[PDB]
Design a protein around this ligand. Structure first.
Ligand SMILES: *[C@@H]1O[C@H](CO)[C@@H](O[C@@H]2O[C@H](CO)[C@@H](O[C@@H]3O[C@H](CO)[C@@H](O)[C@H](O)[C@@H]3O)[C@H](O)[C@H]2NC(C)=O)[C@H](O)[C@H]1NC(C)=O
Ligand SMILES: *[C@@H]1O[C@H](CO)[C@@H](O[C@@H]2O[C@H](CO)[C@@H](O)[C@H](O)[C@H]2NC(C)=O)[C@H](O)[C@H]1NC(C)=O
Ligand SMILES: *[C@@H]1O[C@H](CO)[C@@H](O[C@@H]2O[C@H](CO)[C@@H](O)[C@H](O)[C@H]2NC(C)=O)[C@H](O)[C@H]1NC(C)=O
Ligand SMILES: *[C@@H]1O[C@H](CO)[C@@H](O[C@@H]2O[C@H](CO)[C@@H](O)[C@H](O)[C@H]2NC(C)=O)[C@H](O)[C@H]1NC(C)=O
Ligand SMILES: *[C@@H]1O[C@H](CO)[C@@H](O[C@@H]2O[C@H](CO)[C@@H](O)[C@H](O)[C@H]2NC(C)=O)[C@H](O)[C@H]1NC(C)=O
Ligand SMILES: *[C@@H]1O[C@H](CO)[C@@H](O[C@@H]2O[C@H](CO)[C@@H](O)[C@H](O)[C@H]2NC(C)=O)[C@H](O)[C@H]1NC(C)=O
Ligand SMILES: *[C@@H]1O[C@H](CO)[C@@H](O[C@@H]2O[C@H](CO)[C@@H](O)[C@H](O)[C@H]2NC(C)=O)[C@H](O)[C@H]1NC(C)=O
Ligand SMILES: *[C@@H]1O[C@H](CO)[C@@H](O[C@@H]2O[C@H](CO)[C@@H](O)[C@H](O)[C@H]2NC(C)=O)[C@H](O)[C@H]1NC(C)=O
Ligand SMILES: *[C@@H]1O[C@H](CO)[C@@H](O)[C@H](O)[C@H]1NC(C)=O
Ligand SMILES: *[C@@H]1O[C@H](CO)[C@@H](O)[C@H](O)[C@H]1NC(C)=O
Ligand SMILES: *[C@@H]1O[C@H](CO)[C@@H](O)[C@H](O)[C@H]1NC(C)=O
Ligand SMILES: *[C@@H]1O[C@H](CO)[C@@H](O)[C@H](O)[C@H]1NC(C)=O
Ligand SMILES: *[C@@H]1O[C@H](CO)[C@@H](O)[C@H](O)[C@H]1NC(C)=O
Ligand SMILES: *[C@@H]1O[C@H](CO)[C@@H](O)[C@H](O)[C@H]1NC(C)=O
Lengths: 35, 86, 370, 99, 244, 49, 50, 34, 50
């Protein structure tokens, strides 16, 4: 580089996948009631 | 930019109207602010008044309704909000 | 004015900003220290003998009153040129700790007296800083500094291990080693004396006639002022927008009896970004506080040129006590009114209230019936 | 009444506006390459032909700063207008009816 | 007028913690209720400073001097390069009468001193001085902690001072107090070394507890807090701590 | 801008605080991005399986 | 004149950097609008029938 | 400590998991207990 | 050999043709040099900042 930097995102992709899995399992099992 | 200088004013004059659209933009922003407040709050056409006697089945809006004692006529929560932020 | 700025012969009913007004200053106030004494320029200009370039004679000038007109009209000065200030304004300012450097040098090297200049004496005898301020004066001195035998009193450096930092005095006469073999303090091959002597002879014409040079260097507000110009002070007034010049510090505003506490060494004050909020006058030594005299924008309220040709003029954020663009016509007996937005001229306030046209500000708004 | 720092949005809006004004006014104290940061001094010191040069440097620097300030103001005003439109919508749907 | 001595007095120069001493008003501009950041030659916080219970010491950039003195034993100062008639030096003497300052090519022997007679008439600090330019007389400079800051910048010798009643026994007090400007000297001299001058009872010299603190200055950046009265009352060093 | 040069830095000094102002905006952008992701995805209180 | 040339370089690179920052700001505004839309969609279509 | 975001000096790494206080990056963040 | 730059140098496994002198990757940034003495291929990495 030449004085420019790229910072990493706070939430890693594994954590994002975990959120999506949680959402999708909840909506499969509970419905809308879990919101 | 110049601050009460004929020479500076004359020198700046030959730049064209750089700072006429500047004032135009600032005034547009201010008018936009007034419109924002007007359209957010003035949703009503009349000015309703709660009756002098209040019995709403058991609910207590006293902390929310204005108190005639305070000259500002702002309610308790509104007073808290106004005092908190500076 | 609304027609002029809006570029139409017809103006619709509304409020339009036209211009801004500023209270004009009245008279002026010049206040200089009461100390008066002639400044001794004759001896620094009429010294019989001058040293060499590497021994440039420096003198400090302070606590004097100086006129530069006598140094201006003197045609005897071959060259008279200033860098940081105009020569005609020299007798209009006040400095402190002036420096006068006098010496005798080569007329061919007179161009070397300039910032960012490299020559022979410019780099090995006397170097000017790039941010130099002041004046340079030079005039021919063949009759004084040249003799039929040749004046060898004037030496100048040729060999140096390095360059010169600006404003230095070097007199070190060490032998110079011009080769790999060390001289060991002994002159010989690759060992030469850095200084060389001038051979000023009257037989030589222009370009070899020695020249006398004096350089004046100043400061710009780094200490209490002590060398003011030949101007004369005058009285001070308060509670009026005037132009003031406190000891070279110029400004325009209204003065007032200040209330803050100053320490004895403290001269003036400020709060944020060069806003001089107080001054101690050189004569009375009293603290006064400064504030710029009032100004603000102006707006118009018209019911529409289609309907009438009457207007109401609003001066924004200005106390109505003082208002009279000239427009004294709207100051004689016309109705006036005050409000949080400013002062309103040409409209009359009314008891009753109702939903309104064109707005003004702070909950006050106007219309046409007057 | 007790818990503080519950009004972060309004407070930081005010703080951003104050910071913009403060940097704008502080920018008036920069040489930009000229010999001074105060115009009266160069007016009162030197000859107008080079006063033109010095004042020109001052003028270009101050114009640049002012333009930057104005553009930032425009962006921030756009954000505020978006929020105000959202507020009006929420007042319509939630206050004047059930959502 | 001076003869050598045999009792080679030596001061046990220990090291102590500077803490927050050596803050002076940088400029002559009034300010009030404001945080102002400035870069200048200061004395870094929490540094080590040399405490003595008469050697020649380098001057370097600047010098912070302090004396929590009783009865004002310390008298004067000498600055220069070689301290001889060959090179111009600086002398300051503050006796019971008006302080007197000279810049001359004085001649010094091994140890200079004033001396007192007991009706006091005794002064044999130097021997000869051939040629010099500047002299000065003004009000005298001086249980009580006296602090002085000596700077030599741009042909200007700035001397700042402060006095404070002190009751703490030994260590430099855990307090904070700015140093107001006291005097400027408009002459440039190549100051690199300096000495100290005392007042011995010349009847046999009896002066051994010449306790004073010495420190050196470095260029750093500080943040200063001016109260409502425009008095420097708090400061924060920058290049000391990540928090700072 | 200066590429590790001293004289360039000294010349750049007299432009005032442009770089503080510039770098104060990129930080706002980055914080905004993190907030965007958090408010899009973190809609739930627990983690289900 | 080295300082003059340095001045030219400095002003050019300053203009370039400022332009970059302004473009970044505009693009960030666009992305924020899109993210708000996504949050609304995911709170109204995933967590309930619309 | 060496982490995906860089290197951390003055902080002790633990095994527990809490809600985030001062987001450092790459999924890890710090707090005060030391 | 007149190519001036600052960085950390390592051995490289790139394969130059028998007539080049140095390489670069993109946007005019030098990336590998061949030594004028030994005629061997090295690699360049800018030493870290942050
Ligand atoms: C101001 O005084 C200082 C000393 O307090 C001078 O600096 C040092 O002066 C000594 C004098 O003996 C130098 O020692 C010798 O100098 C000669 C010529 O420079 C050199 O060839 C020898 O090898 C030996 O070093 C010493 O170098 C010098 N140090 C420095 C850093 O200058 C100083 O010259 C005096 N003048 C000024 C303007 O500072
Ligand atoms: C409705 O609720 C409010 C809540 O504040 C009641 O206000 C009370 O007023 C009395 C007299 O000033 C105070 O002593 C109480 O402390 C207040 N209540 C609280 C919770 O602070 C109000 O009286 C209620 N209205 C009724 C009961 O008719
Ligand atoms: C240096 O000396 C010259 C000549 O003595 C001064 O020039 C003045 O010249 C006019 C007419 O030529 C005389 O009437 C004056 O009497 C001269 N002044 C003096 C003081 O004698 C010149 O002014 C002197 N330099 C300065 C700085 O005063
Ligand atoms: C305009 O100026 C006048 C004169 O200074 C102000 O009148 C003073 O008002 C204060 C209170 O606001 C009184 O205590 C004084 O007695 C008034 N007269 C004076 C000072 O001579 C007037 O208030 C100003 N208008 C505004 C809007 O501030
Ligand atoms: C010590 O105090 C005496 C008394 O004031 C001073 O020495 C001389 O004092 C007389 C009277 O004012 C002056 O005329 C002399 O010029 C003083 N001597 C010198 C060398 O200046 C002075 O205050 C002190 N003596 C010193 C510092 O040498
Ligand atoms: C002051 O006195 C000193 C000591 O004599 C002078 O120094 C030398 O004086 C002799 C006198 O014949 C000269 O030949 C030397 O050239 C002088 N050397 C130096 C380095 O000055 C000195 O000149 C006298 N004047 C001043 C202003 O110091
Ligand atoms: C600034 O100085 C003033 C005095 O010039 C201080 O005023 C003091 O106010 C208290 C409150 O009544 C009085 O008891 C004192 O007597 C006042 N001081 C004097 C010297 O009379 C003021 O407190 C100072 N500001 C500070 C210390 O922040
Ligand atoms: C310059 O060329 C000479 C030619 O002999 C090189 O000498 C040998 O080069 C081979 C291959 O480069 C090496 O394996 C040998 O070890 C070298 N031997 C000696 C005695 O030099 C030489 O390396 C080349 N470079 C230099 C700097 O001399
Ligand atoms: C300044 O001088 C004038 C006349 O020379 C005098 O009237 C005035 O009192 C002086 N200033 C002071 C503070 O004494
Ligand atoms: C002025 O107003 C009258 C009545 O409202 C209208 O008839 C007329 O057209 C207006 N003037 C113009 C120039 O439109
Ligand atoms: C109403 O008019 C009366 C005059 O009788 C005046 O005293 C009063 O200030 C007016 N009030 C308002 C609100 O206009
Ligand atoms: C310097 O300061 C340190 C700080 O603790 C101290 O330990 C030391 O004795 C001082 N003197 C020297 C010569 O290190
Ligand atoms: C020598 O001086 C020291 C320090 O003042 C003192 O303590 C000691 O008694 C002296 N000795 C003599 C013999 O004078
Ligand atoms: C914590 O994590 C480290 C990293 O793998 C592991 O070595 C350690 O056993 C874990 N538990 C504790 C108590 O440190």
């Amino acid at each position: 580089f030449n004085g420019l930097t790229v910072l990493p995102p706070l939430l890693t992709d594994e954590m994002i996948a975990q959120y999506t899995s949680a959402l999708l399992a909840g909506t499969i099992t509970s419905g809308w009631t879990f919101g | 930019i110049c601050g009460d200088s004929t020479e500076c004013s004359n020198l700046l004059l030959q730049y064209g109207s750089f700072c006429t659209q500047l004032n135009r933009a600032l005034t547009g922003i201010a008018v936009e602010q007034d419109k924002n407040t007007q359209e957010v709050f003035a949703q009503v056409k009349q000015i309703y008044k709660t009756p002098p006697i209040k019995d709403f089945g058991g609910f207590n809006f006293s902390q929310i309704l204005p108190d005639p004692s305070k000259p500002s006529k702002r309610s308790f929560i509104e007073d808290l909000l106004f005092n908190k932020v500076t | 004015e609304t027609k002029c700025t809006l570029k139409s012969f017809t103006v619709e009913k509304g409020i339009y900003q036209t211009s801004n007004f500023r209270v004009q200053p009245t008279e002026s106030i010049v206040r200089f220290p009461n100390i008066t004494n002639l400044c001794p320029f004759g001896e620094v200009f009429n010294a019989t003998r001058f040293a060499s370039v590497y021994a440039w004679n420096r003198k400090r000038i302070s606590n004097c009153v100086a006129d530069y007109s006598v140094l201006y009209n003197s045609a005897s000065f071959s060259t008279f040129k200033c860098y940081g200030v105009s020569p005609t304004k020299l007798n209009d300012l006040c400095f402190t700790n002036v420096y006068a450097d006098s010496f005798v040098i080569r007329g061919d090297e007179v161009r070397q007296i300039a910032p960012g200049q490299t020559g022979t004496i410019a780099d090995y005898n006397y170097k000017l800083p790039d941010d130099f301020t002041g004046c340079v004066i030079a005039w021919n001195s063949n009759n004084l500094d040249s003799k039929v035998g040749g004046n060898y009193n004037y030496l100048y450096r040729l060999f140096r291990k390095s360059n010169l930092k600006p404003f230095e005095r070097d007199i070190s006469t060490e032998i110079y080693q011009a080769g790999s073999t060390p001289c060991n303090g002994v002159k010989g091959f690759n060992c030469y004396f850095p200084l060389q002597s001038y051979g000023f002879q009257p037989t030589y014409g222009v370009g070899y006639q020695p020249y006398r040079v004096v350089v004046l260097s100043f400061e710009l507000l780094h200490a209490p002022a002590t060398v003011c110009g030949p101007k004369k002070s005058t009285n001070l007034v308060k509670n009026k927008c005037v132009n003031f010049n406190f000891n070279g510090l110029t400004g325009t505003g209204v003065l007032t009896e200040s209330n803050k506490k100053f320490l004895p060494f403290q001269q003036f004050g400020r709060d944020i970004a060069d806003t001089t909020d107080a001054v101690r006058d050189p004569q009375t030594l009293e603290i006064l506080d400064i504030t710029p005299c009032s100004f603000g924008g102006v707006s118009v309220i018209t019911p529409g040129t289609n309907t009438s040709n009457q207007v109401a003029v609003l001066y924004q954020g200005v106390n109505c006590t003082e208002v009279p663009p000239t427009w004294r016509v709207y100051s004689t007996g016309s109705n006036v009114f005050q409000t949080r937005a400013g002062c309103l001229i040409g409209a009359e306030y009314v008891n009753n209230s109702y939903e309104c046209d064109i707005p003004i500000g702070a909950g006050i708004c106007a219309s046409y019936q007057s | 009444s007790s818990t503080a720092s519950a009004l972060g949005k309004l407070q930081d809006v005010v703080n951003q506006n104050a910071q913009a004004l403060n940097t704008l006014v502080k920018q008036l104290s920069s040489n930009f390459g000229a010999i001074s940061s105060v115009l009266n001094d160069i007016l009162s010191r030197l000859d107008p032909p080079e006063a033109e040069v010095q004042i020109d440097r001052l003028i270009t620097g101050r114009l640049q700063s002012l333009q930057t300030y104005v553009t930032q103001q425009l962006i921030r005003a756009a954000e505020i207008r978006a929020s105000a439109n959202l507020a009006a919508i929420k007042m319509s749907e939630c206050v004047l009816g059930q959502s | 007028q001076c003869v050598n001595f045999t009792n080679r007095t030596q001061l046990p120069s220990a090291y102590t913690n500077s803490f927050t001493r050596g803050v002076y008003y940088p400029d002559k501009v009034f300010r009030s209720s404001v945080l102002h950041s400035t870069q200048d030659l200061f004395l870094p916080f929490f540094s080590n400073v040399t405490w003595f219970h008469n050697p020649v010491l380098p001057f370097n950039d600047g010098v912070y001097f302090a004396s929590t003195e009783k009865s004002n034993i310390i008298r004067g100062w000498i600055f220069g390069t070689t301290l001889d008639s060959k090179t111009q030096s600086l002398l300051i003497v503050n006796n019971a009468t008006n302080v007197v300052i000279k810049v001359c090519e004085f001649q010094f022997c091994n140890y200079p001193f004033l001396g007192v007679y007991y009706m006091e008439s005794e002064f044999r600090v130097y021997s000869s001085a051939n040629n010099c330019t500047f002299e000065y007389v003004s009000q005298p400079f001086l249980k009580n902690l006296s602090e002085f800051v000596f700077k030599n910048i741009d042909g200007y010798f700035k001397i700042y001072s402060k006095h404070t009643p002190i009751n703490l026994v030994r260590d430099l007090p855990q307090g904070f107090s700015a140093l107001e400007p006291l005097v400027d000297l408009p002459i440039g001299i190549n100051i690199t070394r300096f000495q100290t001058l005392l007042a011995l009872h010349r009847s046999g010299w009896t002066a051994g507890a010449a306790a004073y603190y010495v420190g050196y200055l470095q260029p750093r950046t500080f943040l200063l807090k001016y109260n409502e009265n425009g008095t420097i009352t708090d400061a924060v060093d920058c290049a000391l701590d990540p928090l700072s």
